[PDB]
Scaffold this active site. Structure first.
Site, PDB file in Angstrom:
ATOM      1  CG  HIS A 155      -2.055  -0.897   1.258  1.00  0.00           C
ATOM      2  ND1 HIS A 155      -3.012  -1.041   0.268  1.00  0.00           N
ATOM      3  CD2 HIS A 155      -2.432  -1.732   2.267  1.00  0.00           C
ATOM      4  CE1 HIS A 155      -3.914  -1.955   0.634  1.00  0.00           C
ATOM      5  NE2 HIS A 155      -3.562  -2.414   1.839  1.00  0.00           N
ATOM      6  CG  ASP A 159      -0.064  -3.934   2.654  1.00  0.00           C
ATOM      7  OD1 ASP A 159       0.242  -3.479   1.534  1.00  0.00           O
ATOM      8  OD2 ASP A 159      -0.011  -3.187   3.668  1.00  0.00           O
ATOM      9  CB  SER A 174       1.771   1.016   7.137  1.00  0.00           C
ATOM     10  OG  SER A 174       2.113   1.172   5.948  1.00  0.00           O
ATOM     11  N   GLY A 175       4.779  -0.874   6.666  1.00  0.00           N
ATOM     12  CA  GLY A 175       5.940  -1.376   6.058  1.00  0.00           C
ATOM     13  C   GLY A 175       7.085  -1.732   6.952  1.00  0.00           C
TER      14      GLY A 175
HETATM   15  C1  LIG Z   1       1.322   5.050   3.258  1.00  0.00           C
HETATM   16  C2  LIG Z   1       0.633   3.796   3.823  1.00  0.00           C
HETATM   17  C3  LIG Z   1      -0.436   3.232   2.879  1.00  0.00           C
HETATM   18  C4  LIG Z   1       0.004   4.113   5.198  1.00  0.00           C
HETATM   19  N1  LIG Z   1      -1.091   5.079   5.052  1.00  0.00           N
HETATM   20  C5  LIG Z   1      -1.919   5.479   6.023  1.00  0.00           C
HETATM   21  N2  LIG Z   1      -1.886   4.788   7.224  1.00  0.00           N
HETATM   22  C6  LIG Z   1      -2.669   5.230   8.259  1.00  0.00           C
HETATM   23  N3  LIG Z   1      -2.702   4.529   9.385  1.00  0.00           N
HETATM   24  C7  LIG Z   1      -1.948   3.413   9.903  1.00  0.00           C
HETATM   25  C8  LIG Z   1      -0.677   3.087   9.431  1.00  0.00           C
HETATM   26  C9  LIG Z   1       0.009   2.012   9.981  1.00  0.00           C
HETATM   27  C10 LIG Z   1      -0.531   1.301  11.031  1.00  0.00           C
HETATM   28  C11 LIG Z   1      -1.852   1.543  11.424  1.00  0.00           C
HETATM   29  C12 LIG Z   1      -2.565   0.848  12.553  1.00  0.00           C
HETATM   30  N4  LIG Z   1      -1.875   0.176  13.702  1.00  0.00           N
HETATM   31  C13 LIG Z   1      -2.524   2.689  10.882  1.00  0.00           C
HETATM   32  C14 LIG Z   1      -3.464   6.367   8.094  1.00  0.00           C
HETATM   33  C15 LIG Z   1      -4.326   6.876   9.110  1.00  0.00           C
HETATM   34  C16 LIG Z   1      -5.055   8.042   8.836  1.00  0.00           C
HETATM   35  C17 LIG Z   1      -5.151   8.585   7.546  1.00  0.00           C
HETATM   36  C18 LIG Z   1      -4.333   8.069   6.512  1.00  0.00           C
HETATM   37  C19 LIG Z   1      -3.467   6.984   6.821  1.00  0.00           C
HETATM   38  N5  LIG Z   1      -2.660   6.555   5.854  1.00  0.00           N
HETATM   39  C20 LIG Z   1       1.048   4.613   6.198  1.00  0.00           C
HETATM   40  O1  LIG Z   1       1.187   5.842   6.268  1.00  0.00           O
HETATM   41  O2  LIG Z   1       1.657   3.727   6.855  1.00  0.00           O
END
Ligand SMILES: CC(C)[C@H](Nc1nc(Nc2cccc(CN)c2)c2ccccc2n1)C(=O)O
Length: 228
Positions: free
Chosen positions: A41, A89, A183-184
């Site tokens: 993602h 993912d 994330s990642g």
């Molecule tokens: C870029 C990735 C696709 C990802 N996006 C992302 N992740 C969110 N949340 C998130 C990320 C990692 C872990 C978890 C839950 N434990 C919750 C989040 C929350 C609010 C609005 C936009 C959000 N975009 C990130 O930034 O890791």
């Protein structure tokens, strides 16, 4: 990371910052000499932006002897990943050359035995994601210790309501949690990589919406294939 603390500089030499156009985007983990594992993602919407990986870092902004920004020869999302699903993912980034190893840059061994971790196992999650509800971004690596939450609790209707497959695992999210920008990154249990943070469930720090992490062991043969 919500509810965490500043990590000891360079004590997680596997930690990577996946960067888009010179800004931190996601975590990652050095898993081989020329490969970083992260989440699909992260690059869903990256289009032809400049994707790089920062190894050896503690501070995103300050110079450090071990800090080196790598270019990316190839980005390999898992073929069954999709926007808007939580499954599969994973993303493998092949650096443009082998990373220079040392005490601050080292691949982390990863779990190939496909069995669940014991409930409550204290695992370490680190990252440069946001640190409060306002969205503050830290300059330096943060981390938190989180206990593994058994899959049945995690699958309760009050929690993730059946969406946690055998290929996913959960950790508690009560105020301490991974969050946006994390994330990642790696979930490390007993010194070995067990999971990769996923954003599939986007809320941060709500105990009834545990952290979800992709189980590396479930994807061993895919990782091996791409690595080789
Ligand atoms: C870029 C990735 C696709 C990802 N996006 C992302 N992740 C969110 N949340 C998130 C990320 C990692 C872990 C978890 C839950 N434990 C919750 C989040 C929350 C609010 C609005 C936009 C959000 N975009 C990130 O930034 O890791």
């Amino acid at each position: 990371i919500l509810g965490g603390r500043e990590a000891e500089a360079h004590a997680r030499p596997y930690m990577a910052s996946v960067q888009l156009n010179g800004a931190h985007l996601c975590g990652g983990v050095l898993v081989a000499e020329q490969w970083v594992l992260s989440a699909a993602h992260c690059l869903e919407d990256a289009a032809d932006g400049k994707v790089q990986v920062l190894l050896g870092a503690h501070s995103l902004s300050q110079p450090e002897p071990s800090k080196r920004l790598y270019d990316v020869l190839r980005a390999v999302p898992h073929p069954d990943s999709q926007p808007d699903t939580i499954d599969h993912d994973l993303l493998l980034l092949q650096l443009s050359e082998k990373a220079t190893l040392g005490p601050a840059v080292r691949p982390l061994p990863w779990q190939r035995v496909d069995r669940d971790v014991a409930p409550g196992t204290l695992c370490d999650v680190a990252g440069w994601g946001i640190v409060n509800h306002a969205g503050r971004r830290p300059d330096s690596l943060q981390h938190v210790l989180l206990p593994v939450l058994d899959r049945a609790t995690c699958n309760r209707r009050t929690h993730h309501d059946g969406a946690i497959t055998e290929r996913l695992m959960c950790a508690e999210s009560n105020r301490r949690d991974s969050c946006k920008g994390d994330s990642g990154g790696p979930l490390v249990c007993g010194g070995v990589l067990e999971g990769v943070v996923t954003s599939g469930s986007r809320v941060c720090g709500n105990r009834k919406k545990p952290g979800i992490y992709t189980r590396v062991a479930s994807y061993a043969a895919w990782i091996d294939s791409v690595l080789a």
